Symmetry: C4
Subunit: 165 residues, 4 copies
């Protein structure tokens, strides 16, 4: 008939690599895992590969707000958000976006629509931020509050927009 039983996938392994040696009784053999476990492991591992190739507001309130909450809070001068913090979070936001999405938007516009100007500006900041975020940050720090908060607002709008169409 077979064995009564099969071994379940190891939860440590689903998150990366099990560090428990032979002491461990769960399965570490991908050929016997159900698909869901293998799909979950792939997402943990992709996060790890991506983090380990990255180049270089950790407190409780900032974490709960996230980069978006911090940026929204700076624009409304609430929650005690400095301009320094808002400029780091902005780099983080720009790293999360990608130009190719701005470009699909950009080409849905009537010619010399004013929105084409804002797109190309955000696109420009993504590229710069990709090259060197530390440079890019400084650059945001020199912008006057009013214009900074407007660029930010533009970026957040596009961020949301891309994700809900």
């Amino acid at each position: 008939l077979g064995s009564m039983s099969r071994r379940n996938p190891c939860k440590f392994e689903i998150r990366g690599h099990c560090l428990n040696g032979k002491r461990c009784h769960f399965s570490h053999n991908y050929f016997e895992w159900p698909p869901h476990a293998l799909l979950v492991r792939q997402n943990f591992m992709l996060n790890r590969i991506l983090k380990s190739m990255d180049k270089s507001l950790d407190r409780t309130e900032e974490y709960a707000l996230g980069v978006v909450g911090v940026l929204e809070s700076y624009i409304g001068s609430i929650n005690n958000i400095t301009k320094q913090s808002a400029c780091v979070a902005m780099s983080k936001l720009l790293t999360e976006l990608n130009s190719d999405d701005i470009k699909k938007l950009r080409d849905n516009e009537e010619l010399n629509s004013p929105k084409i100007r804002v797109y190309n500006t955000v696109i420009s900041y993504i590229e710069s931020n990709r090259k060197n975020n530390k440079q890019t940050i400084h650059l945001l720090k020199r912008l006057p509050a009013d214009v900074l908060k407007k660029t930010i607002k533009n970026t957040l709008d596009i961020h949301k927009s891309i994700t809900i169409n």
Copy 2:
């Protein structure tokens, strides 16, 4: 019975990383996502990892044509495509192909078939372009129009061919 409800996966997270902190009510826990969402996220994340390890015609018309449309347009002297532009797009095309596919084609040929010569040329350009695209581009810029447009045409033919067999 359980709860009446389960949380849906977060669309921001499906595209990368949700930047909305604790403010966000959607699921960010891969163990509770349905498979489709996890498969979609993997493709967004692979695109990101691949882009962030790359080394270095953005206008509306070029974007709509794509690298292939630009290359086809240069060969027919339409759409206002410079030789410079056609040589960049060609590098982009060569980055998208891979030698191993030319080689499976190459070994379907009668010995000293003339097609073996063209394959080994494209293969040669992929390798060069991999090493340094900027060098490779210059090299394409010095080729005479007639021969350039023929090499291009060869590359596009193989590109299409690999994808429809």
Copy 3:
């Protein structure tokens, strides 16, 4: 009707790349593979990409214990584990964890809970270990046994905890 038969996926390819040339009769065409095989291959390949971007207790007993067994054994002065070995294994453990998980834990705490202090310490070690494990290791080697074994114990507790909630 079709052919009586389809080719099965190649087990070498499921693990990476088949090195058997045309001599091989199994399928190497991902369009004809069943989903399970493609999910298994992705996990082998992600392990390979991750290993090939990493920067730099191999014996039988250590391997069976794993990094966790080694660390648990040092704390109880059994199994013949040196302080050197325990500090390498600790780096390996810290590479396997990620800060973002400590931070989700950290924000479940009453303000000035003593546990917040320990979290921020582990978080601090992950970041350091990420920067340079060799530096980080030395740093662990200078800590006095009693405190080392306590930091270790904290790390293992969090490791287990993250994985079973």
Copy 4:
């Protein structure tokens, strides 16, 4: 009712990135793809990421034999395989294996089994080859034919063995 129809995924995109701009009528939206297509794309993309992070017998006969056929052919002095070629192919074979698999084998052995010696040798070559294949190759070229062919044979045996258990 909905539309009569849905767009099929783009075969170019399944293999990487479609370079056909807006001219293209197939779907490039991963949210509407069926799972199989998304699983196939992930394997093409993982191959690309892996190739683009690699560091540095292309002829018809060699390609058909593959690295394994070349190595088997050298050992039997057939097919016109030089010692140089056999040493490159050997590096390629060593890149495809991974130590962690030799180690699971190694710990299935009675103590001071002679097989433990051979494992640790192969393991040693993988690590060296990982560090610098060009160095590692030279090193294989200096080994005397008889011993080379024996090391090779050991490596192939383990390669096959790992894959069929």
